[PDB]
């Protein structure tokens, strides 16, 4: 099912590098630059000449070293807004997958690793001519600088009531009668109740899938069964809470319908927090105490909590923010909020666990607007000519080496009007 595509001296490219790196980028919001065949193997032929050059220098490149990504494999790509067949309708198996993310992004990294040794001009606090004598020819096209803020919080878990999870235990011993005495389907009730999405639209299933993979009380409480419409008992997980009826199994697969019911937070009990997180801020404002030690008290994001309370932004690895890369409730809280001003208790989507929690911010700096000044704004100008000039000399050094390292390309696909088309006689 797969061809060679190109060959990049001793390494080679598959179709099926192709087509997975075409999937994910059309994930990534890819907008093409015209047939993807063109440019795809392309993009991949020049993350070889880095990786080959990567090499050839010295191991100075840790060529990834394979676990180095591991970290980030896990941590961003398994984290998805879904996974297991979600992931898996393209081709290849989730193993695999594994293998080739990991293979695709330890090769990324080195890529990184090598442009960043391939230039030694970028220096810090160093004129680069004054700023090429200070946006040399400046045209009547500018750039914007939009507005920078700097943001702190205090953040509260809402502690999930006991009589809600004894209500979803209810809902479902009841669920468990209903079906039993026959006065409605379970495939009906696991479709309108479960909050398994994706189990719930087919019916409540979960297909012949096993493996272990199931999370381990469920599994442990799954096999166990064996009279077919058997009503499990309510076993809690990392998810929420499950009753399960076995389909079918064959060997250690096994096909088992679950109605999922997640204890989910009262609006009272949001209520309640946010009035104390009022009462901390009224506290906070008669300085009887500074946001900056409730921080450290009584925050509860623990990345932040120690460090002021202040947010820190993933883009730019620093505390400023741009109105964007913030979460949808802070910036929409911090619009209307001025300098050094406390914000009302709100309740906001924890990003990463994707539960409720309340909290409150303090805008701690805010540059509004503006425009590129060059009295500033000056290490914007510097970074912008750097980097222009660093991309025109690796596409020097990339013009270079594609005439001095070897290229072979299907006959199929030596068609496309390639971009840096050094690749031919």
């Known amino acids: ?26 994930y990534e919001g890819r907008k093409f630059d015209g047939d993807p065949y063109c440019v795809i193997p392309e993009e991949l032929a020049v993350q070889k000449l880095y990786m080959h050059q990567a090499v050839l220098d010295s191991i100075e490149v840790p060529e990834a070293e394979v676990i180095q990504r591991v970290d980030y494999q896990i941590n961003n790509y398994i984290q998805a807004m879904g996974t297991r067949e979600k992931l898996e309708e393209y081709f290849n198996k989730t193993s695999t997958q594994i293998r080739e993310a990991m293979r695709e992004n330890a ?93 719930a639209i087919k019916g409540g299933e979960t297909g012949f899938m096993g493996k272990g993979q199931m999370v381990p009380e469920y599994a442990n409480v799954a096999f166990n069964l064996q009279d077919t419409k058997k009503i499990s008992k309510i076993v809690e997980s990392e998810y929420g809470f499950h009753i399960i009826q076995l389909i079918e199994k064959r060997g250690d697969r096994i096909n088992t319908r679950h109605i ?15 009035a104390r997180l009022d009462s901390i801020a009224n506290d906070i404002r008669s300085d ?86 060059i009295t500033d704004d000056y290490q914007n100008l510097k ?30 696909w030596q068609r496309c009007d390639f971009k840096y088309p050094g690749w031919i006689k």
Not at 1 to 26: N, Q, T
């Open 1 to 26: 099912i797969d061809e060679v595509v190109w060959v990049i001296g001793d390494e080679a490219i598959l179709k099926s590098d192709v087509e997975e790196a075409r999937l994910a980028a059309l």
């Open 288 to 373: 009887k105490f500074t946001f900056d030690q409730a921080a450290s008290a009584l925050s509860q994001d623990k990345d932040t909590r120690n460090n002021h309370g202040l947010m820190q932004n993933p883009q730019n690895q620093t505390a400023k923010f741009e109105m964007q890369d913030l979460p949808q409730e802070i910036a929409k809280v911090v619009d209307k909020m001025n300098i050094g001003e406390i914000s009302k208790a709100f309740t906001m989507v924890n990003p990463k666990d994707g539960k409720e929690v309340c909290a409150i911010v303090k805008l701690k700096s805010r540059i509004n607007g503006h425009k590129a000044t």
């Open 107 to 199: 090769r990324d990294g080195l890529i990184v690793q090598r442009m960043q040794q391939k230039l030694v001009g970028d220096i810090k606090v160093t004129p680069a001519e004054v700023r090429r004598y200070f946006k040399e020819l400046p045209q009547d096209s500018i750039p914007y600088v939009p507005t920078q803020v700097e943001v702190q919080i205090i953040t509260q878990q809402p502690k999930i009531p006991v009589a809600e999870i004894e209500d979803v235990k209810r809902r479902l011993r009841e669920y468990t009668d209903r079906i039993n005495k026959g006065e409605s389907d379970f495939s009906t009730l696991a479709l309108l109740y479960s909050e398994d999405r994706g189990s």
């Open 383 to 412: 970074e912008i000519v750097l980097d222009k000039r660093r991309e025109e000399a690796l596409q020097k050094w990339i013009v270079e080496k594609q005439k001095h390292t070897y290229v072979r390309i299907n006959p199929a």
């Open 260 to 274: 999922l019911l997640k204890p989910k937070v009262s609006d009272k009990e949001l209520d309640e927090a946010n």
